[PDB]
């Protein structure tokens, strides 16, 4: 049930803001941060995240996900290897500073790598003329937009099981845009007319909260 | 024609990678970086980006855009104020470290603020279960995906001028997903069935390169 966050960066403050309610352990060796963690409804564990014994202490085993952002990619990797000695199946989401290190984070055991500076650099080069790309990305991720991005799973025995993307006319029917469909660790963005849904597929969509509802019901049983 | 980049961060390396060819002046006071800039086909100007006279030196006046990322938000703001004393109309894109400072960057003169750590923190909290949101955002911004995000303007005398979003059936017709339409500094994400296009509107879409073409032609008078 619980999520362990290893290290502290400006990212994890924004991260805890969205996990409020959910049970979170933050494991860091910077006491100055304990005050901030507690304020977020989270729990603080003073410790060295590159040390296996201190990961045990944050109870990494059986946690549903471990988020990892240390001060440098080199230490981020040291933490991951540490986590993998403990629990080799647990989901690890790591933050990468330099592009060059993305492959090594993945290699040490990261299931998903997020690169704020790559994202950020690409957005800045695309914002020279019109800043729409930047506006879109920063807006759909905000808890305050009329439009939001969601993942809706297609359940076993779904009305849509077997139906093609073209035949389902989901946009016309529910108001939701399908931006992609994903299954396991693969994502198909803007799927082709002839893609056939299967129970287990995750629909990645954008829509008003009511449109999302019309979609959830349009699927089921 | 030229773009001035003020300061150096991990972001601006990724930024220059995408502006290769385009003429770029980087103004920073860290000589260690000169080697890196030159390698990117960019030009280096040693100087203090909070100093008006050194902005003049990077020729900020008449540049098409100034990207600003200094070591702290406090200094980023100092730079923007400096720019605005020189040229009060030029486009400024700034990177913000802390969320609290986004309003102050905007206030000092920034036309667009990008917040890699906010983006990154939100993505990490959404990647706990399925990392699709993260995969989508990092993939459409990559120059190597079959699917890419583009801004296609609707030209004066366009076939679509006056047509509603619903009547234009752009997805069915061109294979491109409309994720939003923008005009000036406003962006409407996932526009409603009854929105009417006007010359000048920018369509923000996702699609295969050929679909983008069928779209561009589908518009033009
Ligand atoms: Ca753009
Ligand atoms: Ca809609
Ligand atoms: Ca998710
Ligand atoms: Ca398509």
From Swiss-Prot, chains A, B:
A GO BP entry: potassium ion transport
Swiss-Prot/TrEMBL keywords: Calcium, Cell membrane, Ion channel, Ion transport, Membrane, Metal-binding, Potassium, Potassium transport, Transmembrane, Transmembrane helix, Transport
Topology class, membrane: Multi-pass membrane protein
An example molecular function term from Gene Ontology annotations: identical protein binding
Binding site for Ca(2+): 69, 95, 97
A Gene Ontology cellular-component term: plasma membrane
Residue ranges of every copy of the RCK N-terminal domain listed in the record: 1-115
UniProt-annotated location(s): Cell membrane
Domain RCK C-terminal: 137-221
Other remarks in the entry: It is not known whether calcium is the physiological ligand.
Domains as described in the record: The channel is composed of 4 repeated units, each containing a transmembrane pore part and a gating ring part. The gating ring is composed of eight identical RCK (Regulators of K conductance) domains, in an alternating arrangement of one domain from each of the four subunits and four from the intracellular solution. Two protein interfaces between dimers of RCK domains from the pore-forming subunit and from the intracellular solution hold the ring together. One is called the fixed interface and the other the flexible interface. The flexible interface forms a cleft where calcium binds.
Quaternary structure and interacting proteins, as annotated: Homotetramer.
UniProt name for this protein: Calcium-gated potassium channel MthK
Underlying gene: mthK
Residues of the full protein shown: 116 to 336 of 336
